[PDB]
Short mmCIF file of all heavy atoms in Angstrom, two decimals:
data_model
loop_
_atom_site.label_atom_id
_atom_site.label_comp_id
_atom_site.label_asym_id
_atom_site.label_seq_id
_atom_site.Cartn_x
_atom_site.Cartn_y
_atom_site.Cartn_z
N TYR A 110 10.73 -2.82 9.71
CA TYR A 110 11.60 -2.87 10.87
C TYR A 110 12.57 -4.02 10.72
O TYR A 110 12.19 -5.09 10.25
CB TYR A 110 10.77 -3.08 12.14
CG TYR A 110 9.90 -1.90 12.55
CD1 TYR A 110 8.57 -1.82 12.12
CD2 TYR A 110 10.38 -0.88 13.34
CE1 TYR A 110 7.77 -0.77 12.49
CE2 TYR A 110 9.58 0.18 13.72
CZ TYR A 110 8.27 0.23 13.27
OH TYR A 110 7.47 1.26 13.63
N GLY A 111 13.80 -3.81 11.11
CA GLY A 111 14.80 -4.86 10.99
C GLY A 111 14.63 -5.93 12.07
O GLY A 111 14.44 -5.65 13.24
N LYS A 112 14.69 -7.18 11.63
CA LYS A 112 14.67 -8.28 12.57
C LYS A 112 16.10 -8.59 13.02
O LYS A 112 16.40 -8.76 14.19
CB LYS A 112 14.04 -9.52 11.94
CG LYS A 112 12.61 -9.33 11.49
CD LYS A 112 12.15 -10.51 10.70
CE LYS A 112 10.94 -10.19 9.88
NZ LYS A 112 10.86 -11.19 8.78
N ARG A 113 17.00 -8.63 12.02
CA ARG A 113 18.39 -8.93 12.28
C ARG A 113 19.32 -8.22 11.29
O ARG A 113 19.07 -8.23 10.08
CB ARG A 113 18.64 -10.43 12.19
CG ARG A 113 20.10 -10.76 12.00
CD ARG A 113 20.31 -12.21 11.64
NE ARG A 113 21.38 -12.37 10.66
CZ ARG A 113 21.15 -12.49 9.36
NH1 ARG A 113 19.93 -12.45 8.86
NH2 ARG A 113 22.20 -12.63 8.53
N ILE A 114 20.42 -7.69 11.80
CA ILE A 114 21.43 -7.10 10.94
C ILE A 114 22.85 -7.63 11.18
O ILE A 114 23.23 -7.98 12.32
CB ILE A 114 21.44 -5.56 11.04
CG1 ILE A 114 21.93 -5.09 12.41
CG2 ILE A 114 20.09 -4.99 10.74
CD1 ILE A 114 22.01 -3.58 12.56
N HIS A 115 23.64 -7.69 10.15
CA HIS A 115 25.00 -8.13 10.24
C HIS A 115 25.98 -7.00 9.86
O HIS A 115 26.02 -6.58 8.71
CB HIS A 115 25.25 -9.35 9.32
CG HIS A 115 26.61 -9.96 9.45
ND1 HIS A 115 27.16 -10.75 8.47
CD2 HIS A 115 27.51 -9.89 10.45
CE1 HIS A 115 28.37 -11.13 8.84
NE2 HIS A 115 28.58 -10.65 10.06
N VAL A 116 26.69 -6.48 10.85
CA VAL A 116 27.63 -5.39 10.64
C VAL A 116 29.03 -5.84 11.00
O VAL A 116 29.20 -6.64 11.93
CB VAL A 116 27.28 -4.16 11.50
CG1 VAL A 116 25.86 -3.66 11.15
CG2 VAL A 116 27.36 -4.50 12.96
N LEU A 117 30.01 -5.37 10.24
CA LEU A 117 31.41 -5.62 10.52
C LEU A 117 32.15 -4.31 10.61
O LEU A 117 31.86 -3.36 9.85
CB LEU A 117 32.05 -6.50 9.44
CG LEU A 117 31.58 -7.94 9.28
CD1 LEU A 117 32.26 -8.59 8.08
CD2 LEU A 117 31.82 -8.74 10.53
N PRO A 118 33.12 -4.20 11.53
CA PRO A 118 34.01 -3.05 11.55
C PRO A 118 35.03 -3.13 10.42
O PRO A 118 35.41 -4.23 10.01
CB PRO A 118 34.71 -3.19 12.90
CG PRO A 118 34.72 -4.66 13.14
CD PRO A 118 33.43 -5.19 12.57
N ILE A 119 35.46 -1.98 9.88
CA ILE A 119 36.52 -1.96 8.90
C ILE A 119 37.87 -2.09 9.60
O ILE A 119 38.32 -1.15 10.24
CB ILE A 119 36.49 -0.66 8.09
CG1 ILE A 119 35.05 -0.23 7.77
CG2 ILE A 119 37.29 -0.78 6.80
CD1 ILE A 119 34.49 -0.80 6.47
N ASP A 120 38.52 -3.26 9.47
CA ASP A 120 39.61 -3.65 10.35
C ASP A 120 40.94 -2.90 10.16
O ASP A 120 41.96 -3.26 10.78
CB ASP A 120 39.86 -5.18 10.31
CG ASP A 120 39.60 -5.79 8.93
OD1 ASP A 120 38.49 -5.54 8.34
OD2 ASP A 120 40.47 -6.51 8.43
N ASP A 121 40.96 -1.88 9.31
CA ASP A 121 42.17 -1.07 9.16
C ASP A 121 41.99 0.27 9.83
O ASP A 121 41.57 0.37 11.00
CB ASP A 121 42.47 -0.86 7.67
CG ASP A 121 41.34 -0.25 6.92
OD1 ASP A 121 40.15 -0.57 7.22
OD2 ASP A 121 41.57 0.59 5.97
N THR A 127 40.48 -1.61 19.99
CA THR A 127 40.09 -2.59 20.98
C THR A 127 38.93 -2.12 21.85
O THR A 127 38.61 -0.93 21.89
CB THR A 127 41.25 -3.01 21.88
OG1 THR A 127 41.74 -1.86 22.59
CG2 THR A 127 42.37 -3.63 21.06
#
Side-chain angles (χ1 to χ4, degrees):
Chain A
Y110 291 93
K112 299 172 198 158
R113 161 191 142 263
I114 68 177
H115 185 202
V116 300
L117 294 176
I119 320 271
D120 35 307
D121 57 324
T127 60

